[PDB]
Design a protein around this motif. Structure first.
Motif: not given
Length: 434
Positions: A226, A259, A265, A306
């Protein structure tokens, strides 16, 4: 006394909104209806997938999640909830099967609703009526996945100087990647005078990485890492713990847009380096942990799929409820200062906390030794954190990772054989090419 309010949540995590990562063919949990009063012998309810609610949910969060194939989701006992009068709750098993043909790197939704409840139960609104699973298929991205429930790594790169592809320098002897989560440290919050509002401001090194995310960041995500954008104060009136409610809503929207645009992530928030706010500006307020919590909550609302994570520093962490919603729902990971373990607030658990923080450039915070690994396991910690590794210091960095991997994963960290130079995708040989 007769008002018995019900709401729905995932039984294993106790979250109303739960991200599920599929690393195998099935994922099993329970859906749990919680009650505010003791039920009677006639109390009853069922659960169902509520596909129509997904449109309402996507509108509320400005998201675009597709519906997970309903044929892959099954409930025990026809979705009827088994009432436990002694625990003010009712539960039913739900299994999520992994499917074929669904698009990679895409989050799907399972909206679940209470249905056919007895008249003694009150459901206040559509939020209480539903819980949601946000499902991502990770079966091909298992290199960073070291097993269900293992401790996980959280690593900050100082991207002014170091290429985050160096994540790939850190593997166990079995090839698994050590660092589950990496942070690009850091984009900034700064004041935009022409707009009269805070904005995300990226220095040229951060911006170069984002512009070139396909070559310098996505290879990490393909292997299960991530990648989070770090946000940090930067010497003006704006700061991550001094936005008003409106300022936090606006800033959270911008963070979520970053993002989405760069296929990341989530975020880390670190409240350091801001100056005093201009309290006359409607986007700002007195610096406080309450303002920081507001920003975290609003950020999670803008990107519920997220990670919203914080460095426990400054005024960034400590208030446990926003608008009646506990921090368990909007702080996914908290990391603490070097030499300390983080602690949970609200209904968070220690699985959301770092048990060690290692400053790899400056030296503080200790080592991920066998003994320390076992201590963190014994304490229930979910994370170990590291800050600012660099190829030039890999001797020291990897010395601090000896022993721990065998305890955490059954495979020690391997000596590095590859490193990356700034802004360069080429895998160089470590140490010969230094």
């Amino acid at each position: 006394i007769y008002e018995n309010n019900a709401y729905l949540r995932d039984g294993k995590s106790n979250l109303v909104s739960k991200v599920v990562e599929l690393h195998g063919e099935t994922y099993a949990t329970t859906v749990k209806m919680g009650l505010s009063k003791t039920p009677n012998t006639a109390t009853s309810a069922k659960v169902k997938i509520d596909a129509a609610y997904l449109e309402t949910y996507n509108k509320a969060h400005n998201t675009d999640f597709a519906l997970y194939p309903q044929d892959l989701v099954t409930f025990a006992n026809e979705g009827i909830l088994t009432v436990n009068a002694n625990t003010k709750s009712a539960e039913v098993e739900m299994t999520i099967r992994a499917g074929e043909g669904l698009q990679e790197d895409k989050t799907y939704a399972i909206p679940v609703a209470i249905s056919d409840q007895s008249s003694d139960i009150t459901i206040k609104d559509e939020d209480a009526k539903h819980c949601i699973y946000l499902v991502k298929d990770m079966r091909n991205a298992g290199d960073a996945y070291k097993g269900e429930g293992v401790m996980q790594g959280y690593l900050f790169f100082e991207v002014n100087d170091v290429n985050p592809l160096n994540t790939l320098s850190f593997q166990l002897e079995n090839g698994k990647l050590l660092w589950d989560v990496v942070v690009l440290f850091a984009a900034n919050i700064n004041y935009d005078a022409e707009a009269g509002r805070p904005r995300v401001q990226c220095n040229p090194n951060v911006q170069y990485l984002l512009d070139n995310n396909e070559t310098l960041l996505q290879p990490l995500r393909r292997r299960g890492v991530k990648v989070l954008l770090g946000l940090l104060g930067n010497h003006d009136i704006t700061g991550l713990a001094q936005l008003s409610e409106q300022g936090a809503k606006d800033f959270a929207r911008e963070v979520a847009q970053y993002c989405k645009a760069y296929n990341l992530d989530g975020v880390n928030y670190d409240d350091e380096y801001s100056n005093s706010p201009d309290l006359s500006n409607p986007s700002l307020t007195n610096p406080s942990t309450a303002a920081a919590a507001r920003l975290c909550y609003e950020t999670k609302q803008a990107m519920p799929d997220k990670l919203v994570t914080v460095f426990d520093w400054g005024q960034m962490y400590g208030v446990a409820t926003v608008d009646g919603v506990d921090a368990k729902e909007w702080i996914d990971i908290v990391v603490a200062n070097y030499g300390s373990a983080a602690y949970p607030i609200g209904q968070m658990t220690k699985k959301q906390c770092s048990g060690i923080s290692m400053e790899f450039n400056l030296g503080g915070g200790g080592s991920l030794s066998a003994s320390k690994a076992q201590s963190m396991i014994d304490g229930g910690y979910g994370w170990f954190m590291g800050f600012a590794p660099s190829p030039a210091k890999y001797g020291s960095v990897f010395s601090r990772l000896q022993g721990g991997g065998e305890v955490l994963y059954g495979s020690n960290v391997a000596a590095p054989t590859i490193f990356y130079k700034k802004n360069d995708p080429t895998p160089y040989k470590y140490p010969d090419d230094l």
